[PDB]
Amino acid sequence: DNTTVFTRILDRLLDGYDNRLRPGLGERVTEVKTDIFVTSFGPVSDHDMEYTIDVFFRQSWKDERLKFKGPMTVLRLNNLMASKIWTPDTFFHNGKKSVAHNMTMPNKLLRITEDGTLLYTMRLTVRAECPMHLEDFPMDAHACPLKFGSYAYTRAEVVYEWTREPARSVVVAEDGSRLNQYDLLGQTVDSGIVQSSTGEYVVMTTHFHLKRKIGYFVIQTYLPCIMTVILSQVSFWLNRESVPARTVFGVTTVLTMTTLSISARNSLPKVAYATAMDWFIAVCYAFVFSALIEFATVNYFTKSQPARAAKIDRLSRIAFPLLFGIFNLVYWATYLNR
Amino acid sequence: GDVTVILNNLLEGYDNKLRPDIGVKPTLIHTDMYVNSIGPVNAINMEYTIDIFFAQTWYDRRLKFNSTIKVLRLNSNMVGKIWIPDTFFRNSKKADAHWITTPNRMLRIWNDGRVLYTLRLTIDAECQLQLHNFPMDEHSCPLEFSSYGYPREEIVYQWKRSSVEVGDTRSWRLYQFSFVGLRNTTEVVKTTSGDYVVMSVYFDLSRRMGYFTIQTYIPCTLIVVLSWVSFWINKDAVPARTSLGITTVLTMTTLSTIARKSLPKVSYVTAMDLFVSVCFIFVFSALVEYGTLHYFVSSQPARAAKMDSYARIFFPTAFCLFNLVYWVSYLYL
């Protein structure tokens, strides 16, 4: 009998209630207040050009059909109650296959205040498209967007607003970063309008600004390529008659860059253009391949024009170390600053 | 209040198992489509991913209502209450609607009975590719849909004036293909259970060789050019002229399998396989030439001296001749 008071209230609210009609139909526009709490900003996939994010997706709106009076002012009900009332049909525009969690129960809450205000949050795993231009790979930055809005209601029926100031309406958890090769430099929260053949819709937008971390590539690609280039230039000091000695340096250095370039390509992103990684590998291969040509040129001129052959080695000991120094100065100053 | 009365009157006695005009005339359905993005073309499995906003319109005289309200703008809670055409995608491999946060469906009803029904779908459609000229040919991946149980005497489809609309073409995930255009046609397919009206959309794709140049063409050419260095090395440097003659052959073997990583296990020979196979001939021929020089060292000592000079001219000329034939025939079919 003590809890039958609250049972009678719930049966009264739903007595004659119609969940096919939005609140204030024919009277006003349904305003929905939205905020997002990012529990964890998941991994970013370059091959799929998508990112994962786990959020608490809170929405709030007023429905005068659900006013009540009783011993309590807020009814913290089960998520079962949500399916019997009207809820916004918010969908993510750029969202790919997403997950609503169901363990051990549907991860949803519903709270009704005495004036009819509703709060309705849910836990989701959102996968969204993040178009990427990898011309500066691996020194590139991206602004991954998150867009959501109504699917069936135009902006003359349902509008979306942020619960607080737009800057504070999306909060990222302190320990939620699950990024392995990116840094979340910040975020931008905005709003807009999208027009279709069925009308105009309100779309809420949040951009996450990410910058790739270059540490992995310096270990795996840049340093092995630089050391191989420096190794290939040792042959310019050995005398012209040390054919067995210069053979081991020429063949191994040329083979190492061939191995590195093929090995690197497997993990490199699949694009139709050339990234900043490709130009470094291509140029580093030119220096290694030119050194072998220099060995073959000097060896060809040995025993016929020894003075000419010795002249080539004097210049290669200077030009090759200098030119590779100049290229690195231009390369790193071009991409790091931008 | 009044909208509730209209909705409750429409469904009173309504039977959703019976299509409109079940014994009078075929139901005419006007279909639209907005392509959000054509995903990457998986040539290995011969399929592609496409995300669309599929729209359908038809009349239903059981859904007429007289009032001052002109359109009933409704959510997805009513889709299962009325009759819905059973449209399916014939060449689909895997498709599913979108259910976050609610079903991405829309139902609008006009007072003359007209129904607009729209939903968001993601489709992995089958696309068979003829790779004899890969990667320098044009393809047209189709997308077919029709009713499943209703023959041409019960349901007829028809494209609208502005049927297929695309957004930003260049923002799509295609990287080894470039979108060209789209065509929509209509035919009739006769199955064992009747004749059905089948609607098709074709997406034309060009070559876009940018990706395969970095992976195969440039690496193979560099190895072949590397192989020519053996012709300016003294013949007494046997380890030098042999390591270049056995390492490049091994590397060219590795690149041969890499070229086929992006292709299905097809029986025939693609254009890219022809390039790699010919390149493997040149690097192997250079190894043979060095051996041929030693065989003639004592038999015809004067001939062996001029053999290296002939190598320095024949191999660069033959490879340039081959590229002239290769890149003119394929690129200007």
Epitope: H133, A141, A143, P145, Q195 | D168, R170
Partner: nanobody, 123 residues
Framework: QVQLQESGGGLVQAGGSLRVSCAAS????????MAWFRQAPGKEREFLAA???????YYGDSVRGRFTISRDYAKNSVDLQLDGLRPEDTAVYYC?????????????????WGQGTQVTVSS
Amino acid sequence: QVQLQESGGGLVQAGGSLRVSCAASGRTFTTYIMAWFRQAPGKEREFLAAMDQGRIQYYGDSVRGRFTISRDYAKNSVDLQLDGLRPEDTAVYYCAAGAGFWGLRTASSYHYWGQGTQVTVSS
């Protein structure tokens, strides 16, 4: 050299409609965010409107609900519509493109800037 050639603009009297158009060449910029900026003489540069690859319209507070922005992705062109022109609207209008990093309402986020079209309102 990448050039965002502009046209349209001009001079109008006592208000009225005006269409300012923009075009891009060299590399397809549909993958970028194209926006319109207004710089009053000597005051500062002001954001007006933007549209991204997803066909999403963002508007500034002063020109909210008055101006219309649309893009033609086939021709890689962005057109801005000016309606109800006022004497305070006399300024120079620029065409910008970029990736929208650190916000699409910031001028510094657009790498490419147009030449600029002069628009004068007489009243």
